[PDB]
């Protein structure tokens, strides 16, 4: 809200150029109006003097950018990804689940190609006319609209170029256009009950990318910089703050307290799984421990391997015990592709974040009988969030089943860990979390569930052919538990509950 105070403090030219590009608080073009609309009609090449950009076939390149406005960014984080997605959150979320339903959606931006970045001015910038915070292209699509005789303040635009702006922009602002094949989109599949499965593709909202960037640019204990190498192809959001992408570092180096201070059934243990090089970029906005929907898929791909032998396993829950944690940048070398002109080189360069988790699991199934010794090793999966999953040879003698979960935490032969739950306090913005993250500096954030944009629908090339929606990411908060003598296990032993538009994983106490 710095309109004329920031217009002439006599600093420099590009103070305004940093102020319309949507990684900044807005301005409100109310008092001085014609001197600002002569800027956006002069931000196309890279006042009232460098004209002939007004009443020509300039509008043919100016109308094509309003179709590509991208509520969500389908090119995040891989460059070659065709798609147009512009739809709001489709529903609502409860009090302790941060997502982009909790912040208002007004930072959408052109992401198609390189040439039309500057020519995507004049209809994709947002300027807060008198009331509404609004853009410029979702306003000039009707006749009885003000600040349009100020288009006739410039004596160039004849009223037959008005006759195209009448009827060109008519019905645009609700579409979703992704085709699953041939495309570089990611997609997974998750159970919705014990009968079917729902496919879903996570995307990246560039309102949460804007919001976390322009609020974390002056605290360094809580921000980790992640760069990319072709900023123009990603769109103007990754060009304005070019490369940088401040995103929510873990908060402190990991601390290992003593584990526990103690003196139906079907509790199975898995001691000290070691993971080599799992990714840490869980959500598009957080860095740290991986998303706990990957701890869910590690369990559900394990219970399907045993059901190949006895088809009544029904794992029903799981419990996580983190002993070591280590995050750093390492770089993932992608290999040679056929580029497209005539050559064989590598694809585009990025930064990554990789992790190293030593953890152990408790599993509360219903199978009230012994499993085996041999095929309980052969049925283990070999990956956890793009990583490896190995144990030992000599730790195959600590794998046992039990029927009482208070002797089950005695079977872990390490005793230097930590347990995990969810923090049930309201987190309506980013400022709620960092206030709780500076009182503790021992709490982690990750993606705990998804959030649909769709009912869902049957799409042709969906992965395993099930049913395909499009989802967001649900930020949550992760806690430390000692399990002394009195903490009930309902704050442990998480599950998947399917709340009809969001698939959040939370423990079974709520």
């Amino acid at each position: 809200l710095k309109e004329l105070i920031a217009s002439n403090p006599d600093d420099l030219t590009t103070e305004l150029k940093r102020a319309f590009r949507p990684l900044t608080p807005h301005i409100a073009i109310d008092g001085n109006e014609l001197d600002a609309l002569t800027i956006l009609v002069n931000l196309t090449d890279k006042a009232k003097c460098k004209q002939k950009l007004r009443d020509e076939k300039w509008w043919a390149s100016c109308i094509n950018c309003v179709n590509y406005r991208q509520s969500h960014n389908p090119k995040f984080p891989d460059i070659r990804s065709e798609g147009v997605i512009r739809t709001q959150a489709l529903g609502e979320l409860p009090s302790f689940l941060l997502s982009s339903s909790k912040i208002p959606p007004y930072h959408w931006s052109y992401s198609h190609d390189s040439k039309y970045v500057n020519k995507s001015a004049f209809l994709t910038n947002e300027f807060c006319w008198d009331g509404e915070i609004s853009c410029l292209g979702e306003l000039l699509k009707d006749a009885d609209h003000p600040l349009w005789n100020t288009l006739k303040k410039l004596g160039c635009s004849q009223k037959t170029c008005k006759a195209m702006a009448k009827q060109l922009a008519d019905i645009t602002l609700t579409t979703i256009n992704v085709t699953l094949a041939p495309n570089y989109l990611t997609q997974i599949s998750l159970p919705d009950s014990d009968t079917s499965y729902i496919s879903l593709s996570p995307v990246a909202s560039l309102s949460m990318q804007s919001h976390f960037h322009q609020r974390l640019q002056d605290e360094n204990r809580h921000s980790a910089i992640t760069r990319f190498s072709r900023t123009t192809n990603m769109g103007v959001t990754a060009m304005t703050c070019g490369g940088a992408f401040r995103m929510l570092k873990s908060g402190a180096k990991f601390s290992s307290p003593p584990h526990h201070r103690l003196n139906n059934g079907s509790f199975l243990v898995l001691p000290n799984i070691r993971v080599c090089g799992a990714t840490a970029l869980s959500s598009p906005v957080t860095v740290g421990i991986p998303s706990l929907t990957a701890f869910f898929g590690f369990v559900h791909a394990f219970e399907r391997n045993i059901n190949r032998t006895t088809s009544s396993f029904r794992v029903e829950s799981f419990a996580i015990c983190v002993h070591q944690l280590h995050v750093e940048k390492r770089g993932l070398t992608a290999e040679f592709v056929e580029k497209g002109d005539g050559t064989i080189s590598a694809p585009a360069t990025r930064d990554d974040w990789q992790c190293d988790v030593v953890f152990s699991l408790i599993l509360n199934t219903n199978f009230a009988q012994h499993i085996d010794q041999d095929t309980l090793v052969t049925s283990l999966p070999k990956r956890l969030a793009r990583g490896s999953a190995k144990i030992a040879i000599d730790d195959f003698k600590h794998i046992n089943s039990f029927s009482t979960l208070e002797t089950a935490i005695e079977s872990l032969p390490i005793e230097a860990g930590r347990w995990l739950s969810l923090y049930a306090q309201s987190n309506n913005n980013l400022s709620d979390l960092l206030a709780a993250m500076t009182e503790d500096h021992q709490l982690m954030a990750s993606c705990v569930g998804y959030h649909l944009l769709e009912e869902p629908k049957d799409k042709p090339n969906s992965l395993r052919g099930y049913k395909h929606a499009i989802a967001e990411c649900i930020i949550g908060l992760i806690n430390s538990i000692t399990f002394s003598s009195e903490t009930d296990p309902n704050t442990i032993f998480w599950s998947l509950k399917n709340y009809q538009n969001y698939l959040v994983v939370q423990p079974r106490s709520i």
Binding site: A181, P182, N183, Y184, R227, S229, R274, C276, G277, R308, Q324, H326, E328, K329, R330, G331, L332, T333, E335, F336, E338, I344, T349, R350, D351, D356, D374, V377, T378, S379, K382, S388, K390, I393, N461, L463, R464, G465
Partner: protein
């Protein structure tokens, strides 16, 4: 052919190679490193010459004799240690038999039949010795066995009933393919790899253990990061062992050491990283380019033709199962076989 989505996933997966220092009184501490700055000298070609001769006039005989600082990392064997030991683990499975993606039936039943008819006709005794000679040689250390006195591999199989099979001094004894075969545990560990590939849900696990004797204060070479941006060079990939920093020597760098078996390309001197364009990293060239006709997608498009050759008793095997040894190498490690996308 080549439908719009087809994918496998890998059948060999290693872990990282953590380093430890051993002391003469049989004690074990992890190996560490710390950063170090140094004074180099102006030696780049683009500081004196600009383009095609024409030396720069603003870079005279005193400007070139400056110094330029650059910061590096540095790791060495500490004084008064015995040797280095290098823990590591491998595994084997059978995921080359069934595809991970679908939606074309005529290539799904063809690519599972071709595995069945390669299995019984010309079995797994060719590939499973090449994958095991790379582990048991010391190819997975990449640079630490050069300028070294001796090294010794000791490997623990699973499921095994016997003593830990170990290979002694490799620079003198285990030279060629012969002396690996004249060991009293060799046919029991190749055949348990043959059991892993050829069984529906079979598994094999090897824990490998090296002992590395080096000279006094000799350096150690781990893997390096790939971050894109006093301009620090040589930042090491690391982990935390015992609350201490430790260089790890890769996780995908070890999968590239084991799968260096491809010597079936038109010149065929040195083995290559197994891939579809057959790229040599120390060159920029591509052996098996997509104009020679010997890249992977021009050998996968005779998959019904190699059905019609394996049935005949007259198998040529001079340059027609080298096209099938190469084809079955890319199914064990490959898994994104898709033409126009992804």
């Amino acid at each position: 052919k080549l439908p719009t989505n087809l994918a496998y996933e890998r059948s060999i997966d290693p872990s990282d190679v953590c380093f430890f220092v051993v002391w003469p009184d049989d004690r074990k501490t992890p190996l560490t490193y710390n950063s170090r700055t140094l004074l180099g000298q102006m030696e780049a070609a683009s500081l004196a010459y600009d383009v095609s001769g024409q030396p720069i006039k603003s870079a005279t005989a005193e400007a070139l004799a400056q110094g330029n600082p650059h910061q590096v990392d540095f790791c060495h064997v500490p004084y008064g240690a015995s040797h280095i030991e290098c823990s590591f683990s491998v595994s084997f499975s059978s995921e080359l038999r069934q595809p991970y993606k679908c939606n074309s039936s005529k290539v799904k039943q063809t690519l599972v039949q071709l595995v069945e008819l390669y299995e019984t006709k010309i079995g797994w005794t060719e590939l499973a010795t090449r994958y095991l000679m790379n582990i048991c040689n010391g190819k997975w250390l990449w640079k630490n066995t050069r300028k070294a006195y001796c090294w010794n591999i000791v490997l623990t199989p699973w499921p095994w009933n016997g003593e830990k099979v170990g290979f002694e001094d490799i620079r003198t004894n285990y030279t060629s393919r012969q002396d690996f075969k004249n060991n009293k545990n060799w046919s029991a560990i190749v055949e348990m790899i043959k059991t892993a590939f050829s069984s529906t849900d079979g598994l094999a696990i090897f824990e490998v253990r090296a002992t590395l004797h080096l000279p006094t204060n000799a350096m150690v070479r781990p893997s390096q990061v790939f971050t894109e941006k006093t301009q620090n060079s040589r930042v090491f990939q690391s982990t935390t062992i015992d609350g201490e920093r430790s260089p790890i020597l890769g996780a995908f760098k070890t999968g590239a050491a084991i799968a260096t078996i491809d010597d079936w390309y038109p010149e065929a001197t040195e083995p290559l990283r197994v891939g579809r364009f057959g790229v040599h990293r120390e060159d920029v060239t591509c052996y098996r380019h997509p104009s020679t006709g010997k890249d992977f997608f021009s050998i996968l498009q005779q998959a019904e033709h190699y059905i019609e050759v394996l049935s005949a008793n007259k198998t040529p095997a001079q340059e027609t199962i080298n096209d099938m040894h190469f084809l079955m190498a890319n199914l064990i490690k490959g898994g994104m076989f898709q033409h126009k996308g992804d």
